[PDB]
Amino acid sequence: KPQVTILATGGTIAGAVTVDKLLAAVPAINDLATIKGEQISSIGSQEMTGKVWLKLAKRVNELLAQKETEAVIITHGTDTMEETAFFLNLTVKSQKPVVLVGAMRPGSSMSADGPMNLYNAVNVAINKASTNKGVVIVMNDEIHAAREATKLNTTAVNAFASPNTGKIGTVYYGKVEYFTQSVRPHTLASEFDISKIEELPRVDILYAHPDDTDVLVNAALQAGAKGIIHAGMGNGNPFPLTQNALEKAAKSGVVVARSSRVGSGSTTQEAEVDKKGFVATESLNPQKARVLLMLALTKTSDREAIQKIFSTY
Amino acid sequence: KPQVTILATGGTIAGSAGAVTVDKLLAAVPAINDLATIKGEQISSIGSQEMTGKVWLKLAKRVNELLAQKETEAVIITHGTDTMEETAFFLNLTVKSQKPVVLVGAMRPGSSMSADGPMNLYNAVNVAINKASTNKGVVIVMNDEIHAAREATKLNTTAVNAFASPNTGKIGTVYYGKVEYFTQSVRPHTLASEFDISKIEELPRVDILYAHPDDTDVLVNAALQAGAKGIIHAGMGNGNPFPLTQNALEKAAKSGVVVARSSRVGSGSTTQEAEVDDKKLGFVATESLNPQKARVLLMLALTKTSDREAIQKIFSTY
Numbered sequence: 001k002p003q004v005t006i007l008a009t010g011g012t013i014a015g016a017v018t019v020d021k022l023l024a025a026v027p028a029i030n031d032l033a034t035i036k037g038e039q040i041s042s043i044g045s046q047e048m049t050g051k052v053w054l055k056l057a058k059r060v061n062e063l064l065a066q067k068e069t070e071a072v073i074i075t076h077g078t079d080t081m082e083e084t085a086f087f088l089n090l091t092v093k094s095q096k097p098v099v100l101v102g103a104m105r106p107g108s109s110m111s112a113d114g115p116m117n118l119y120n121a122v123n124v125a126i127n128k129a130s131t132n133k134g135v136v137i138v139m140n141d142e143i144h145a146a147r148e149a150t151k152l153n154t155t156a157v158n159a160f161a162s163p164n165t166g167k168i169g170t171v172y173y174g175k176v177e178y179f180t181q182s183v184r185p186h187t188l189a190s191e192f193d194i195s196k197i198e199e200l201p202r203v204d205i206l207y208a209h210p211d212d213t214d215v216l217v218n219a220a221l222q223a224g225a226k227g228i229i230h231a232g233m234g235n236g237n238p239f240p241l242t243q244n245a246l247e248k249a250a251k252s253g254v255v256v257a258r259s260s261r262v263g264s265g266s267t268t269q270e271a272e273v274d275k276k277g278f279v280a281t282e283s284l285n286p287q288k289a290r291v292l293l294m295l296a297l298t299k300t301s302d303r304e305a306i307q308k309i310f311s312t313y
Numbered sequence: 314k315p316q317v318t319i320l321a322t323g324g325t326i327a328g329s330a331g332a333v334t335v336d337k338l339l340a341a342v343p344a345i346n347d348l349a350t351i352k353g354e355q356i357s358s359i360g361s362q363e364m365t366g367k368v369w370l371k372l373a374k375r376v377n378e379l380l381a382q383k384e385t386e387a388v389i390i391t392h393g394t395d396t397m398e399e400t401a402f403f404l405n406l407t408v409k410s411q412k413p414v415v416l417v418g419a420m421r422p423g424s425s426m427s428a429d430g431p432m433n434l435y436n437a438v439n440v441a442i443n444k445a446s447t448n449k450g451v452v453i454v455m456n457d458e459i460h461a462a463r464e465a466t467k468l469n470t471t472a473v474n475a476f477a478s479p480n481t482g483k484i485g486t487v488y489y490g491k492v493e494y495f496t497q498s499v500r501p502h503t504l505a506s507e508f509d510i511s512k513i514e515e516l517p518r519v520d521i522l523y524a525h526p527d528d529t530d531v532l533v534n535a536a537l538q539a540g541a542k543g544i545i546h547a548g549m550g551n552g553n554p555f556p557l558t559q560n561a562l563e564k565a566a567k568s569g570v571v572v573a574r575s576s577r578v579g580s581g582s583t584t585q586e587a588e589v590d591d592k593k594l595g596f597v598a599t600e601s602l603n604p605q606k607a608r609v610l611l612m613l614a615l616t617k618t619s620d621r622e623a624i625q626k627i628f629s630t631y
Contacts, residue, residue, distance in 0.1 A: 044588070046553035048526035079550030080526050154551040154581030204532070205523035207547055209605050210364035210396050213520065219535035231523055234395030235470040237362035261605065263579040265470030287525050287577065 002070040002126045004033040005063050007056065009041045009048075009076045009084075013103040013114035018042075022075070025107065026115045029122050032174075033070075045077025045084070045102075050200035050294070053084060057091040057194050064094035071097040071125035075118070078102045078159065081137060082150045086288045088135045089146035090190045090295055090313065095132035098187075099125045100146075101139065104157045113140065113157045123174035133168065133178065134186035143169035145182045147313070150285055152263070163264035164283050184313055191309075192295045201297035203227040203290045208261055212239030217249055226301070227255040227293040230278075231286040236260050236267035246278065255279060255306055257293050259286040269307075279307050315386040315442050317349040318379050322357045322364075322372065322400075326391045326419040327430035329353070338391070341423065342431050345438045348490075349386075361393025361400070361418075366516035366612070369400060373407040373510055380410035387413035387441035391434070394418040394467055394475065397453055401462035402606045405451040406506045406613050406631065413446040414503075416453045416462075420473045429456065429473045439490035446492070449484065450502035459485035461498045463631070466603055468579070479580035480601050500631055508613045517542035517615035519608045524548045524577055528555030533565055542619065543571040543611040547604040552576050552583035559594065566595030571619055573597040573611050573628065575604040585625075597625050 008018040014025040019037025023030055040059060041052045056074070063069045076084055085100045092098055101121035103114030121138040124130050135146035139160040148162035162168075169178035204220035208231055220228055228249055232238055236258035238246060246256045257279040260267045269280040281289035292313055296306045321334035328341030335353025339346055356375060357368045372390070379385045392400055401416045408414055417437035419430030437454040440446050451462035455476040464478035478484075485494035520536035524547055536544055544565055548554055552574035554562060566572040574596050576583045582601040585591060591598055599607040610631055614624045 044553070046524075046526075046549045046555055046588075050527050053526075077550075079553050083526055150578075151550060152579050154576050154578055154583055156581060159578070159581070200527075204529065205525055206532075207521040207523040207545075207604060208362075209521055209608060210361075210369075210399055211366050211516075213539060215535040215539040216520070216522075216532045219531045220529075223529060223531040229523075233362045234393075234467060237360070237395050240363055260470050262466075262470055262475070263468045265472060265475070267470055286523060290525055 001032065001034045003036065003068050004071045004073060004122065004125050005036045005038060005069055006073045006075060007038050007040045007059065009052070009056070009074060010043055010045065012107050013075050013101065014107045014112065014118050022118060026118050028119055032122050033126055045080040048080050048084065053087045054194055054197060054200070056084065057088055060088060060092050060098060061094070061195070064092065064096045069096070071099065073099045073101060073121050073125050076100050076102050078104055078151055083287050083291055085135050085137050085146035085149060086291045089186045090192045090292070091194045092135060092187050095188055097125045097130040097133070098135040100135065100137045104155065104159055119174060120171040124171050124176050127176040129176065129178045134182055138171060141170060141172050142167040143171060143178070147182055147184050147186065197298055200294045201226040203229060203294050203297070205229045205231060205286050205290055208232045208238055208242065210239065212242040214241050214245035217242060217245035221249055221252060221254060225254055226297050227257060229257050229259050229281070229286045229290045229293060231259050231261040232267065234260065234262065236280065250278060253301060255293060255297065255301055255303065257281050257289055257310070259284060259289045277303050279303060279310055281310050314348065314350045316352065316384050317387050317389060317438065317441050318352045318354060318385060319389045319391065320354045320356050320372065320375065321391045322368070323359055323361065323391065323393050325423055326417065327428070327434045328423045338434060342434050345435060348438050349442055361396040364396045364400065369403045370510055370513060370516065372400065373404055376404060376408050376414060377410070377511070380408065380412045385412070387415065387446070389415045389417060389437050389441050392416050392418050394420055398466050399605050399609055401451045401453050401465060402609045405462035405502045406508050406610065407510045408451060408503050411448040411504055413441045413449070414451040415441045416451065418455065420471065420475055435490060436487040440487050440492055443492040445494045449494070450498055452484070454487060457486060457488050458483040459487060459494065463498055463500050463502065508616065510616070513616055516612045519543040519545060519612045519615070521545045521547060521604050521608055522558070524554055524558065526555065528558040530557050530561035533558060533561035537565055537568070537570060541570055542615045543573065545573050545575050545599070545604045545608045545611060547575050547577040548583065550576065550578060551587045552598065553588055562596065563594045569619055571597060571611060571615065571621070571624055573599050573607055573624070575599040575602060575607045579603070595621060597621060597628055599628050
């Protein structure tokens with residue numbers, strides 16, 4: 001029975017009380033693994049902060065550096081699981097499995113999804129093919145690469161998707177199968193190290209629309225934003241008044257990164273915007289681009305260096 | 314051949330009838346001349362990322378004027394793809410006619426290899442003149458698909474198949490001009506809409522905020538200072554705010570600026586009676602829209618009320 005640590009960031013989704021309640025709710029897990037539990041935070045995922053991301057990444061690195069620890073499972077709220085997973089995908093210095101799992105229905109609900117999700121997450125954590133896949137989300141019998149995953153629906157048990165790729169594998173009643181792997185660097189291959197970081201740079205997200213404004217750019221600058229993700233119309237397009245405010249932000253040394261409100265596809269590099277300039281976030285989404293820009297700004301504010309990061313990760 | 318007016322809001326989507334842009338479209342797709350008597354008008358000349366409420370009002374008034382006359386069978390509106398969904402939704406709630414109103418665009422410029430504009434426009438004319446297109450509400454015709462304005466969104470940055478209706482699916486198809494409907498909206502539109510913009514010259518200001526972990530109050534505060542009458546919050550998951558942003562949104566709602574919860578996720582309903590105590594905090598739940606279409610509906614709501622309960626009923630109806 002391989003040793004796995006479950007890190008709870010909140011309540012039960014189905015030696016730490018939350019993890020003991022998971023083992024009681026899903027007793028099959030005890031036949032698969034020797035489970036250790038820790039409570040890292042006790043919040044809804046909409047309450048997450050960069051401090052919790054740092055605490056979690058540092059703790060995961062400590063645990064995976066231990067010979068006895070085969071893998072880490074993190075129980076997490078679904079709303080921002082994609083952001084924590086992506087952050088960890090760039091900051092965990094191990095090839096050992098790191099699996100995020102949650103539940104779209106409360107454990108007390110009819111037809112609660114947490115027990116099967118957690119049972120499947122454990123099977124993914126201990127599977128030999130799970131090594132060097134990067135951080136993964138396991139939801140609804142699916143294995144999603146952290147780079148690609150997002151919550152695409154407000155309520156559905158099948159809310160998680162990878163709209164630009166698709167799931168990298170499946171897990172069905174604990175049977176784990178991989179079909180693809182990410183070719184974008186992750187985990188050990190990532191240049192990012194947060195071992196010496198106490199606070200992440202401030203990065204705001206703006207939502208673009210017709211008859212848009214300058215006042216939200218201005219408020220982000222005044223509040224000491226070091227980066228701004230613009231969730232542009234279509235292929236990363238701003239409204240004119242907003243574009244002028246973004247150019248002002250860029251002149252002040254704030255890194256402006258163009259993404260899209262649309263949900264999928266690449267926000268493509270466009271020289272006339274950028275190479276005069278802004279960063280093109282390419283095939284991410286605004287909230288994952290925010291994570292990558294926060295990590296980039298820990299080591300550079302140079303547009304060209306940050307564009308290379310977006311064009312690589 | 315039925316009388317159809319093409320209203321251009323930007324440039325040529327493919328490649329006098331009353332507008333040079335429309336003369337160019339007829340030269341590029343001369344087969345449309347066999348389908349309809351085409352009149353052209355140029356409402357605006359902008360990329361759709363530059364759209365304003367002023368243009369929306371001008372366009373909706375002109376569509377209402379054309380369709381109110383017995384001689385006009387339908388209108389086609391050529392439009393940039395980025396905000397076609399907002400314009401279509403606005404018109405769906407403000408056009409007082411059952412006659413077809415078809416929005417069409419091109420994901421690739423007309424100069425491109427494999428330009429989608431010609432086939433999209435050809436198909437749009439066939440949808441406009443089809444007898445089954447009546448009382449469908451405003452539609453978007455893209456990539457051989459007919460989408461209901463309530464449901465339609467641009468879901469991809471670049472793809473010719475970028476348009477989708479993630480909560481419902483297309484309502485019909487058009488394949489080399491052959492039109493088939495399979496569904497229709499059951500949410501009130503057009504004639505059944507309570508909204509009347511005939512006298513309105515300026516729409517209420519409505520901002521949209523993008524939620525994330527470690528969120529802020531300062532963007533709510535800036536929207537309030539700029540005279541927002543409403544705020545759409547594109548929340549995490551099922552419309553959930555970060556606590557600091559929640560405090561600021563509560564302040565907004567309680568000061569009389571309507572706060573309507575939507576979601577950043579892309580599909581599904583931002584539901585009532587979930588994790589957010591909407592009655593306590595003073596919020597509206599936008600249910601099954603997305604932030605940018607919720608903004609349109611809120612802007613229209615605000616023309617006639619700021620009452621939380623009345624606006625909740627509007628979101629629960631349209």
